[PDB]
Every structure is written in C-alpha cells, then in structure tokens.
C-alpha cells in the first residue's frame, strides 16, 4: 500500500508529540481538563495507528 | 549586563555537557575512521 | 536488515537503543533545574 510508509510516519510523529506532551500536561498547573481530553485522544489515536501499521504490515 | 543569573545554570550545564559528549563522540568516531583506524 | 518496507527507518532504528541512557542523563538535567534541593 506504501501509504503504510505514512501511517507509520504518522505513528512516529504522533509518538514524538506524546513523549513531550504527556509529561508536560501531567505536571502543568493550568488547563488540565483540556490537556486530559487531548491525552485520551492521543492515546486512542496511537493505539489505532499501531493496529493500522500492524495489519498493513502484511500488505507491504 | 554583567548581571549574573540571566541564563539559568542548569541550562548552561546541560548545553556545555552535551557539547562535551559531542566532541568526545567525534573522537571516538575518529578511532574507527581515517588515521588510527588500522584500516 | 529490517523488512524492506521499513528500510526508510534504518537511521532511527540505529539511535533507539541509546534512549534508556538518555533517561539517566535526564534525571540530572531535572535535578539541576530544581537546584539539587
């Protein structure tokens, strides 16, 4: 499919964003309610992309 | 300003430290390439 | 080699193993930021 080559690049980019983003959210005084919403969203996306890369593996 | 404290000491330490790691890393690279590499 | 689809990622795969070491080093950046209190 080789859009694969991008679904993976997605997961990699998302990953780098969570890695900086999650600990900054967790220790930030201000907007926790929003921060908490986005972390559920990052996490669900991430789990998704891993399943996507996973399945797509077997095509490319 | 000669004002001390303007750049936090932890940033100075982290950056100088990475500078050292990079220079020393280059020296290790050089052990495997060009003169001294045995090759 | 990695399966060829993943080849583009070779340079990243090469740096990954060192990351756990950067965590030990991170403890010190952090501690310097709270002044080793």
């Amino acid at each position: 499919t080789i859009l694969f080559q991008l679904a993976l690049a997605a997961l990699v980019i998302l990953s780098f964003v969570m890695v900086i983003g999650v600990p900054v959210a967790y220790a930030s005084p201000q907007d926790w309610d929003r921060s908490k919403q986005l972390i559920f969203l990052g996490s669900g996306l991430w789990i998704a992309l891993v399943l996507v890369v996973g399945v797509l593996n077997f095509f490319v | 300003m000669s004002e001390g404290g303007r750049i936090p000491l932890w940033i100075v330490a982290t950056v100088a430290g990475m500078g050292v790691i990079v220079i020393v890393g280059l020296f290790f690279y050089g052990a495997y390439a060009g003169l001294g590499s045995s090759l | 080699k990695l399966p060829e689809a993943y080849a583009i990622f070779d340079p990243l795969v090469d740096v990954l193993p060192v990351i756990p070491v950067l965590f030990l080093a991170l403890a010190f950046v952090w501690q310097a930021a709270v002044g080793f209190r």
């Binding site: 220790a27 | 982290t14 | 340079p11 990243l12 740096v15 991170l26 930021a33």
Partner: peptide, 28 residues
C-alpha cells in the same frame, strides 16, 4: 545526517520537557 538528526531531535526532547515545565512554573 539522517542519524545525527534523529539523535539531535530525540536528545533535545528530554531537556525540552524540563525547559517547558520550568517556563510555566510546572510541578518539577
């Protein structure tokens, strides 16, 4: 270059977290 760039990006990240939290009086 590709290797040195991943390295610089990944390496910057840790100090970035500390720097960000420091800047916004976070729970360091």
């Amino acid at each position: 270059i590709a290797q040195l760039t991943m390295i610089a990006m990944i390496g910057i990240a840790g100090p970035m977290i500390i720097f960000l939290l420091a800047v916004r009086r976070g729970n360091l």
